Swiss-Prot record, chain A:
SMART domains tied to this protein: IGc1
Any Gene Ontology CC annotation: extracellular region
Domain of life: Eukaryota
PROSITE patterns the record matches: IG_LIKE, IG_MHC
Gene3D superfamilies to which the protein is assigned, alphabetical: Immunoglobulins (2.60.40.10)
GO biological process terms, semicolon-separated: B cell differentiation
Protein name in the entry: Immunoglobulin kappa constant
InterPro entries: Ig-like_dom, Ig-like_dom_sf, Ig-like_fold, Ig/MHC_CS, Ig_C1-set, Immune_Resp_Modulators
Keyword tags: Disulfide bond, Immunoglobulin domain
Organism encoding this protein: Mus musculus
Disulfide bond sites: C139-C199
Ig-like domain residues: 118-215
Length: 216, 214
């Protein structure tokens, strides 16, 4: 089958700047009838792919002039000449010259934004959950930038590492920020042995950490 | 214009057959060729095959005689049947015209021998002490369910601008996700705020009111 290798796997950009995504095919994509079947797609979070370019460079109607395709044979490029914040998504190349039709593995485009500190919130285990016998303490770290960040849970000042589950949101198309959620899950019995529950966030936006805390 | 829509089961056990339906509205299916494309966890896409207006088909060799694509032209819908599935057949299934000009919304399908587990929906209200703040953040913890997916809305989608729904994580073979909403402190508890949670696999549809901790 014809294999498509995209490069790079991920890249970042500042609105107004341009970006360049490549697609390498294992063999020429020029059909016996001299037509090249290289298609380019844009896929946003929670959506199906959306076709942008057909036949390597032929523009679809309704796609901004921003997007352009070039290349031939085995080497193709998708270029966006003046990136808008809406443009964040995963981009794929596809060939329909040979059977079976194949896709490249995708290229993740991310945006650059001004730095931003996270809004932190801690929540005690709900009564319903404690009734069942477990105790999850949750802390939301919303709307920050850059994505790199550290969270530490502390029980009565004592640092806790085991029992934590973390989850990162995808970058926001509207404001280019990131969000994260951290949960420390304990048995009802273990939670009742301490009083102070603390969530601390360390991020570029500060030398000192943001501390959210509650006591039983 | 041309609008696509997938439908089918959320969970199917190994060795069984998976069957989906693509329902088309707008034009007639005799005006084009139609396909099935799936996306695995990792986001890799595999073109499954297509069916022409004459009933003729092309199937990807990777699906070693386990696939069948047929149609119901009067009903304006086409189908997919995949044999003796295994874990590897877990993915989200999309239907699209053969060139990818139009696509449906996609449908999540998990193949497993594990039993369906409905989520425990717990509310997240701030600890009983507080209030110097102009905004207030609440949340819902959707715990220990299987398989994926579940969807969350706050107040039936009336509250959307300050929402964050986080991707589920796996813990002891079960999924757990959370969602947060931020509103002006003058709206809650003054007015109610409820998170609506749906878990398709177990046919779960629960509304949980966020109550202040007294």
């Amino acid at each position: 089958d014809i294999e498509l290798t995209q490069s790079p796997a991920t890249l970042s950009v500042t609105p107004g700047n341009s970006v360049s995504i490549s697609c390498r095919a294992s063999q020429s994509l020029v059909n016996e009838d001299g037509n090249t079947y290289l298609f380019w797609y844009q896929q946003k979070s929670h959506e199906s792919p959306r076709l942008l370019i057909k036949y390597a460079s032929q523009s679809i109607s309704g796609i901004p002039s921003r997007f352009s395709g070039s290349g031939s044979g085995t080497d193709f490029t998708l270029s966006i000449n003046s990136v808008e914040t809406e443009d964040l998504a995963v981009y794929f190349c596809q060939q329909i010259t040979d059977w079976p039709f194949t896709f490249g593995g995708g290229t993740k485009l991310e945006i650059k934004r001004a730095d931003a500190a996270p809004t932190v919130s801690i929540f005690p285990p709900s009564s319903e959950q404690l009734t069942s016998g477990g105790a999850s303490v949750v802390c939301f770290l919303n709307n920050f930038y850059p994505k790199d960040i550290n969270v530490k849970w502390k029980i009565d000042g004592s640092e806790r590492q085991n029992g934590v589950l973390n989850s990162w949101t995808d970058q926001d198309s509207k404001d280019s920020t990131y969000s994260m959620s951290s949960t420390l899950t304990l048995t009802k019995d273990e939670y009742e042995r301490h009083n102070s529950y603390t969530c601390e966030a360390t991020h570029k936006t500060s030398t000192s950490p943001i501390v959210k805390s509650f006591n039983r | 214009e041309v609008k696509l829509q997938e439908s089918g089961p959320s969970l199917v056990k190994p060795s069984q057959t998976l069957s989906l339906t693509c329902s088309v509205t707008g034009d007639s299916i005799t005006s084009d060729f139609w396909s099935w494309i799936r996306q695995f966890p990792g986001n890799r896409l595999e073109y499954m095959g297509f069916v022409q207006y004459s009933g003729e088909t092309a199937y990807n060799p990777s699906l070693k005689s386990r696939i069948s694509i047929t149609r119901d032209t009067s009903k304006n819908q086409y189908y997919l049947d995949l044999n003796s599935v295994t874990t590897e057949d877990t993915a989200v299934y999309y239907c699209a015209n053969w060139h990818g000009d139009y696509w449906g919304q996609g449908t999540t399908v998990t193949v497993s021998s594990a039993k369906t587990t409905p989520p425990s929906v717990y509310p997240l209200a701030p600890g009983s002490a507080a209030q110097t703040n102009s905004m207030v953040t609440l949340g819902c913890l959707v715990k220990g369910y299987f398989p994926e997916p579940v969807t969350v809305t706050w107040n039936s989608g009336s509250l959307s601008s300050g929402v964050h729904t986080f991707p589920a994580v796996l813990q002891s073979d079960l999924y757990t996700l959370s969602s947060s909403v931020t509103v002006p402190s003058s709206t809650w508890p003054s007015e109610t705020v409820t998170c609506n949670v749906a878990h398709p696999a177990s046919s779960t549809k629960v509304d949980k009111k966020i109550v202040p901790r007294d």
